[PDB]
Amino acid sequence: SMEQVAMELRLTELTRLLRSVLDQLQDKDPARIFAQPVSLKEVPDYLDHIKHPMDFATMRKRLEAQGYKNLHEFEEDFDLIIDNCMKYNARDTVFYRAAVRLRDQGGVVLRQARREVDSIG
Ligand code: NA
């Protein structure tokens, strides 16, 4: 049907917008702290602490399968990246501090993405 096609075109254009958001977020992480999964071969106790690991490469895989149906879903995964880091690592560490700074800088990016998603429909 044409109605199904229109919903597909909408999902594709959301995917386009979320790609640009993901690139912008990732630019706020030049050290690439959040680029790849934590390896269970080097924080071997990681999964006893953190139930839902998340990272930018994992988000990019989901995005390329048009796997985010709305901005809220994408935001949830970004918040997992930040929140997991703030739990596992102490307040005095480079990792925790990098998560704080990414959250603050990412706030700006996400704020405008919400207005664009709402405005375009
Ligand atoms: Na902690």
Short mmCIF file of C-alpha atoms in Angstrom, two decimals, residues 20-22 24-25 28 104-114 116:
data_model
loop_
_atom_site.label_atom_id
_atom_site.label_comp_id
_atom_site.label_asym_id
_atom_site.label_seq_id
_atom_site.Cartn_x
_atom_site.Cartn_y
_atom_site.Cartn_z
CA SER A 20 23.43 13.35 11.93
CA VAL A 21 22.63 13.44 15.69
CA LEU A 22 24.85 10.36 16.29
CA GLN A 24 27.39 15.18 16.33
CA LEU A 25 27.38 13.29 19.68
CA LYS A 28 31.89 15.45 21.50
CA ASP A 104 26.16 18.34 29.00
CA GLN A 105 27.31 18.83 25.41
CA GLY A 106 24.85 16.21 24.11
CA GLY A 107 21.96 18.05 25.81
CA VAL A 108 22.37 20.88 23.27
CA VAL A 109 22.32 18.50 20.27
CA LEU A 110 19.27 16.55 21.51
CA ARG A 111 17.32 19.66 22.39
CA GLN A 112 17.37 20.86 18.78
CA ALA A 113 16.78 17.34 17.38
CA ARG A 114 13.51 17.25 19.41
CA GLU A 116 13.26 19.29 14.34
#
